[model samples]
Target: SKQIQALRYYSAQGYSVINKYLRGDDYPETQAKETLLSRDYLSTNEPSDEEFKNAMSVYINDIAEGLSSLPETDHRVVYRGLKLDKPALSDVLKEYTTIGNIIIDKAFMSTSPDKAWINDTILNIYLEKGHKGRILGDVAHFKGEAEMLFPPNTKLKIESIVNCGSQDFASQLSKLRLSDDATADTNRIKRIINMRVLNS
Candidate 1:
């Protein structure tokens, strides 16, 4: 349940792009860390709080679709990993890790999480359309993706339990937070931390 647990933390922390769901019975306890972009993004001219909420509502549903659409094999693998019982075979039970690229392009994309907007945003920048706003924007996108994959309503619950919204938010969201300098932040000398590494 690390994936689920990790996701909860991110969402609660307000790391997800949606206006932090800190209102009403559904409010998440995790307050967002004040990032450099928060002041700008939250300014009046940008997306309104209601607009952000609406976008997030729509986006979250999209994300849910994406998560539901993941290939059966990937779903099986994930379930197996999460549900597996601990056995006495210490050597055979060594941890298994997945690379972020495949997870995002294949697993997450297939699921259709709302966070994909952020992914598209990242892609636009990667292809030279949008400029990199802030590293945390990318984090918000990823965490949003991961949150969608989780069973519905789990995201809010997880957020309630843990302080979501941190660097870890990117991993839970499922968008690979690439480096500022590289393609998807990939390069020969420097490497982008994959989703698996984030899981670690």
Candidate 2:
């Protein structure tokens, strides 16, 4: 019942609220994101200064057992949050979103099936998609949330950018279709938004 009890974190500025962990020394980002999306294993699978792949693959391996135990289709829609500053976020949009598309940077990323957790955040996004994987993990469900991991190489297309609010997030947005009736739930506030490329 307690297998997934590690890897909780604070935002970069509030990091080290618990400096008694296994990692996250120099990096000020997620303990989970740092370990999960990191590509250390992509280049050096055997071992490295950190055995980054070992932890990555192991966590990937660990999360997969739940998928095996899962009873759904080989399917899922997950929201991931990126923590970066304006120019970096804008620069990402400048390059990837310039083509109206965004690419995955890591082997896989940790995401929440729920968006509210990070709707409070991400102001920068790397829209990864094509809906093939969601390694179900129970990192925080007991405490406050559940977690999923987006596997490698999927991409997202920019549908539109909305300065959205809690109401926008509260809407029952469809994942399989894009609704263009943007006459409600967006004004006085804004945040970057995108839709996942569910098809090729």
Candidate 3:
């Protein structure tokens, strides 16, 4: 099923976020911890590190599902906001709508997913409206980096989406190899690969 595939893809991406957060050296560990910890569940319940990680997974699943269900019109608008064309919008739609549905299914089945505990106004809006545009303006207003993750023209295949850094990182490396700037920089290429390959 496309939705299942999309769920797998975004689930992998969610893991990438969690793993990157835990690894600490490349980025701020504190920031990584804070990203999940700042959510209402941990802020109130004060779970252990292991429990917090579990809760974070649920949170990422919910967010990814919301992102997946973002409407095409809203997506195009977002691309416009990013100053990019809409050729890749279909792929984006395919990937995220599936994710959104899967999360919704899980939430419906489970009596208490982490979303029930989080105090996210934007997420609430997305759930209530069944689209993203209503809250995206506000998201961009406060969290620009969240919006930037989907750069225009970025091609995301299901395989790449599921495995974190595998196909996507390889594709990026291939592009870098062809670039004049990176052609001679073997050390730089290795460094890039090392930084990205783990998630793959």
Please name the candidate that would achieve the greatest TM-score relative to the true structure: 2
Best by lDDT: 2
How do the residues 1-200 of candidate 3 rate in per-residue lDDT, one tens digit apiece? 33333334333333445434433325444554555565453563456778776766666555555544543332221111110124644543343334223211111110111111111000111111123222222223233222312211222111122212466545544433122232333222221211110011
Stretches of model 1 off by over 4 angstroms after superposition: 1-44, 73-148, 154-200
TM-score of each: 0.23, 0.44, 0.29
**Regions more than 4 Å wrong, model 2:** 1-76, 96-99, 118-130, 139-143, 164-189, 198-200
Total backbone collisions for each predicted model: 20, 1, 3
Give one digit per residue, the lDDT tens place, for model 1 in 52-171: 555445444443443334333221111111211236423221222222222212122112222222221122011111211112222233442332233243110011111124555444
What residue pairs clash in candidate 2, if any at all?
A: 163-190
TM-score of 3: 0.29
Local error of candidate 2 at residue 110 (angstroms): 2.2
